[PDB]
Write a protein that binds this ligand. Structure first.
Ligand SMILES: Nc1ncnc2c1ncn2[C@@H]1O[C@H](COP(=O)(O)OP(=O)(O)OP(=O)(O)O)[C@@H](O)[C@H]1O
Length: 508
């Protein structure tokens, strides 16, 4: 039972000094090296004489130096704020205005100029490792101390603060959980950027269990042909990503058990995992375990998980989001805040030791979303779901996407997953068209169809009717959207999710 994240990696430094913690394409760093480098960087940090417990902004991609630096900031009592290299500069500016970092560490080159705050170069961070200064922990981040602050975009950005205690509640669960079923010294693909709290689903278990991270070069992240081929050469056992990223992977010929024989586990979190995605996945990898995991950043990465089965792919029309965690009581509530019994629909709220203390310096949004329930810190997820008698959590969608149409209670994500049932559809997004009144004139759907479908059909109209014919026996009549918008792929957010908002806007 994990007592402290640092202690763990300190132990792997004695116990397994020569085992690799990091790998970028055969270039490697070890647990012994991570201790040595992070100790030296911590000493560097203390020498700067910053405000105690002030947060530090760390700008970069996925290199070894990001991690070594994170660990140093932890050792030396400072929350880190991962900002990813591909961020809008106005966004980077926003984070700084909100968070008031005492320092910025530019692990990759920093494309803004602000006087006011100290800036530390990559070359400086390198020099520090190579100086090899020792380090004695005396004022490491503990208890409810901020460990990291991740920024969430709804439009305007907010900074979720996650404590050492929050992180340990998530991590102890992950590594004991029968769905996740994490192997010793796990060999984890490290695709999600550090600025997305999904990165935690790989670094925290890995470090807690003595594994190895497999990172990719930043210049490789836009070349989609090379990316999946390069990935396939890697001895990775676990794939951690958003469902979308794996849909993208599903185009490559090489994303199969044949070319990736070490890969046994898929960990998905962040957006709906689709029945089809799981289907294609099991074809490509018949033996692999698949895990859907759920939660907002505000409750430390994920609060429920469950293993997805073939029974589940053969029968369900939507995949469940799993067993809530023992230490995080989860509840369904109506619009007057009363707790409902199993099967009924309402907001998903979560409580307990993994619930963030709130957004940094945004007391208004904090007061909207965080509150106390049954004596315990709680968070409004904004999601509609339900809990079953056997305690499995089910996902309905976002409150902001429950709409009224022909005076109804329509969940957009329902129309989407209904349409995704059709054999000719890869990915479907139902979307509202408005008029002058902020009222709903009609439903539309964006459609991406499967391979060899576009070419069995001479005209869009045959296709649309063929599609509607394939799920009319299931779909209620008021829910079938009238118009389809075909696309070859869907836009994604920086974090790799289907960009529902932008899709809604491009029709209004
Ligand atoms: N397994 C899942 N299935 C369905 N939906 C999910 C799942 N996991 C997460 N979500 C959705 O993602 C939300 C969490 O969002 P998150 O904390 O990533 O921030 P965000 O506001 O979506 O933007 P960003 O990703 O940039 O932070 C949940 O509210 C839920 O709507």
């Amino acid at each position: 039972s994990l007592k402290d994240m640092i202690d763990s990696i300190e132990q792997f430094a004695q116990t397994q000094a020569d085992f690799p913690v990091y790998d970028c394409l055969g270039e490697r760093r070890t647990y012994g090296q991570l201790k040595r480098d992070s100790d030296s960087i911590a000493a560097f940090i203390d020498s700067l004489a910053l405000l105690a417990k002030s947060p530090v902004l760390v700008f970069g991609a996925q290199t070894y130096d990001m991690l070594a630096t994170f660990v140093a900031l932890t050792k030396s009592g400072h929350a880190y704020i991962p900002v990813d290299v591909h961020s809008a500069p106005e966004r980077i500016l926003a984070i700084i205005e909100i968070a008031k970092p005492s320092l910025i560490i530019a692990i990759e080159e920093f494309p803004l100029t602000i006087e006011g705050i100290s800036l530390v170069s990559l070359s400086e961070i390198e020099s520090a490792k190579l100086a090899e200064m020792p380090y004695e922990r005396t004022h490491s981040v503990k208890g409810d101390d901020n460990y990291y602050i991740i920024f969430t975009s709804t439009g305007q950005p907010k900074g979720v603060q996650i404590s050492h205690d929050n992180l340990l509640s998530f991590t102890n669960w992950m590594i004991e959980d029968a769905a996740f079923d994490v192997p010793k010294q796990p060999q984890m693909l490290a695709q999600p950027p550090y600025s997305f709290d999904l990165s935690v689903m790989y670094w925290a278990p890995t470090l807690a269990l003595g594994g190895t991270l497999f990172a990719l070069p930043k210049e490789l992240v836009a070349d989609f042909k090379q990316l999946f081929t390069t990935i396939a050469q890697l001895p990775v056992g676990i794939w951690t990503s958003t469902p979308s990223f794996a849909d993208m992977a599903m185009l490559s010929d090489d994303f199969c058990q044949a070319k990736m024989p070490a890969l046994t586990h898929f960990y998905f979190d962040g957006e709906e995992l689709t029945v089809s995605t799981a289907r294609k996945l099991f074809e490509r990898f018949p033996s692999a375990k698949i895990i859907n995991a759920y939660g907002p950043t505000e409750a430390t990465v994920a609060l429920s998980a469950i293993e997805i089965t073939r029974e589940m792919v053969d029968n369900y029309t939507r995949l469940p989001i799993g067993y809530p965690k023992p230490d995080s009581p989860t509840y369904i509530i109506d619009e007057d805040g009363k707790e409902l019994s199993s099967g009924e629909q309402g907001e998903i709220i979560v409580t307990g030791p993994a619930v963030s203390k709130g957004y940094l310096n945004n007391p208004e949004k904090t007061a909207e979303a965080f509150f106390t329930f049954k004596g315990q810190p709680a968070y409004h997820t904004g999601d509609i779901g339900s809990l079953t008698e056997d305690n499995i959590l089910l996902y309905g969608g976002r409150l902001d996407f429950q709409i009224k149409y022909a005076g109804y209670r329509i969940e957009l994500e329902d129309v989407s997953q209904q349409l995704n049932q059709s054999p000719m559809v890869a990915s479907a997004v139902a979307v509202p068209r408005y008029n002058k009144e902020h009222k709903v004139q009609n439903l539309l759907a964006y459609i991406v169809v499967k391979d060899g479908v576009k070419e069995r059909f001479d005209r869009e109209l045959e296709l649309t009717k063929a599609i509607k014919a394939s799920v009319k026996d299931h779909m209620m009549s008021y829910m079938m959207p009238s118009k389809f918008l075909y696309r070859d792929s869907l836009p994604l957010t920086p974090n790799g999710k289907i960009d529902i908002k932008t899709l809604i806007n491009e029709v209004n």
